[PDB]
């Protein structure tokens, strides 16, 4: 998909539902289409327009988190995923994902233990969680 293909769709929306709120309400479609076109900054811009008018949509926060995760912007990805899982706690997978991102970025992140413990509760016996706990144990001080 080209930038031009997405622009043609945005123009169609402008011609038929031109109100700023109707445009914002299409911003998740615009963002996904720009993600198809590998236009990551534009995808972030448009998903933000949508979050402005549909603030409680967990899917939009998760999509923005994925954009930040692709960029390796840990703090922003974790913030988005945290908001998504607050809005829709059925996404237990995001609890493990946050733990994993924090550990990958800086396992001396105090935040890692909190999320590893949350993940351990949701995924009892998980080797993915045990690997993170081993990493935390390896960087613990001694008495």
The domain limits of the chain are 1-143
What architecture does CATH give domain 1-143? Answer: Alpha Horseshoe (1.25)
Residue 72 DSSP label: T
Who's near 104: CB < 8 A, 6+ residues apart?
A: 74
Pick the closest to residue 31 from 61, 56, 71 (CA basis): 61
Cα 24 to the chain's mean position, in Å?
19
**Dihedral in degrees, nearest 10, Cα atoms 96, 100, 103, 109:** -50
Q: Which residue in the block uniquely carries the two structure tokens 């550990």?
A: 103
Resolution, given in Å to one decimal, reads 1.1
Q: Measured between alpha carbons, how far is 126 from 11 in angstroms, rounded to an integer?
A: 48
Q: Measured between alpha carbons, how far is 131 from 123 in angstroms, rounded to an integer?
A: 13
The answer to whether 23 and 14 are in contact (CB under 8 A) is yes
Q: Give the method of determination.
A: X-ray
């Amino acid at each position: 998909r080209s930038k031009a293909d997405v622009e043609r769709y945005i123009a169609s929306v402008q011609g038929s539902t031109p109100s700023p709120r109707q445009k914002s309400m299409k911003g998740f479609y615009f963002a996904k289409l720009y993600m198809e076109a590998k236009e990551y900054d534009l995808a972030k811009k448009y998903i933000c327009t949508y979050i402005n008018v549909q603030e409680r949509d967990p899917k939009a926060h998760r999509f923005l988190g994925l954009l930040y995760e692709l960029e390796e912007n840990t703090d922003k990805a974790v913030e988005c995923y945290r908001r998504s899982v607050e809005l829709n706690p059925m996404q237990k997978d995001l609890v493990l994902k946050i733990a994993e991102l924090l550990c990958k970025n800086d396992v001396t992140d105090g935040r890692a233990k909190y999320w590893v413990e949350r993940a351990a509760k949701l995924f009892p016996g998980s080797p993915a969680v045990y690997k993170l706990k081993e990493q935390l144990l390896d960087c613990e001080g001694e008495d």
